[PDB]
Design a protein around this nucleic acid. Structure first.
Ligand code: MG
Ligand code: MG
Ligand code: MG
Ligand code: MG
Ligand code: MG
Ligand code: MG
Ligand code: MG
Lengths: 167, 92
RNA sequence: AGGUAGCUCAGUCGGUAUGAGCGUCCGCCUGAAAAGCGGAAGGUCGGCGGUUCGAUCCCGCCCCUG
């Protein structure tokens, strides 16, 4: 509604649950918090179990007047999925940003659709699987061109968050 | 009587030995419950002709209550702290 | 005059809170419910302090409602 981008980072800030609390940033400026309230706060206050809350400072959110000019390529897209294993406390957003940074301009959309833990993965690890949609601006992208972009994304996530290709 | 070594000391070692709220719940009714030996002193504390023994009998429960209270809160703190870490999520 | 379990209410006039109703949880019932039975969990007895070996009970002050 404010036409701004927003990042959520882990934080500990009462009355929020210290493990279910995000601090909200616009750029590098904190603007509020969100998540589930602390269970001790909930009981002492007579609140429903699992109550969640969000509070933002509107005056800390800068006003934006963007003038978009989206690139709309009509050429076919290539769909590929990548399954990456990382440590269990590596935020999924950091893995996605690393994948995006390596994929380059051919990457049109990235979406996380599976977070998996288990004996197949290993202790203290988790597996994330992203759906990737590649598209070229001037040509029909080939499977090899997309795979080269996928491999570069895997290399980026490896260097930045220690991701390992799922085997 | 004189149960300062067989009732207070027998409970302060069984209370500190419990590492679970379920284990501590059983030690409660066995050493401080209504059927406890320490409870038998107060159940027959009015059939006595008080001043020289009441503060010595009450001190047997004032010392056994502290062991249960300082262990209950400790195990409650460990339980509450463990639920919070087990409920962590990736907020991103 | 009273304050008593999460709520609504009896009791206990110094030395094991006697208890209910609702609610909550848990089994019976239902594919699952509601309702019903059945049982369980559930009580520093208003704060602050004295008196006392020991206070829900007696004394001082104050919050609370008619
Ligand atoms: Mg393909
Ligand atoms: Mg294909
Ligand atoms: Mg009467
Ligand atoms: Mg009852
Ligand atoms: Mg009963
Ligand atoms: Mg039950
Ligand atoms: Mg209670």
């Amino acid at each position: 509604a404010s036409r701004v981008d927003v990042t959520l980072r882990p934080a500990q800030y009462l009355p929020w649950h210290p493990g279910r609390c995000a601090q909200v940033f616009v750029g590098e400026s904190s603007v509020g918090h969100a998540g589930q309230l602390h269970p001790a706060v909930i009981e002492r206050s007579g609140l429903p179990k699992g109550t969640c809350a969000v509070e933002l400072n509107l005056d800390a959110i800068p006003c934006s007047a963007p003038l978009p000019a989206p690139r709309v390529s009509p050429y076919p897209a290539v769909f590929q999925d990548v399954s990456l294993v990382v440590a269990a406390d590596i935020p999924a957003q950091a893995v996605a940003d690393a994948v995006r940074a390596g994929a380059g301009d051919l990457l049109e959309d990235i979406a996380l659709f599976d977070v998996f833990t288990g004996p197949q993965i290993g202790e203290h690890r988790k597996s994330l699987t992203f759906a990737l949609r590649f598209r070229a601006p001037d040509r029909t992208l080939t499977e090899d061109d997309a795979s080269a972009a996928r491999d570069a994304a895997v290399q980026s996530a490896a260097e930045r968050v220690g991701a390992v290709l799922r085997g | 009587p004189e149960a300062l070594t067989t009732a207070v000391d027998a409970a302060q070692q069984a209370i500190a030995l419990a590492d679970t709220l379920d284990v501590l719940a059983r030690v409660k009714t066995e050493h401080l419950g209504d059927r406890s030996p320490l409870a038998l002193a107060r159940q027959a504390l009015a059939v006595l002709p008080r001043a020289e023994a009441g503060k010595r009998v009450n001190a047997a429960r004032n010392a056994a209550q502290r062991s249960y209270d300082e262990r209950l809160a400790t195990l409650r703190a460990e339980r509450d702290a463990a639920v919070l870490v087990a409920e962590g999520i990736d907020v991103t």
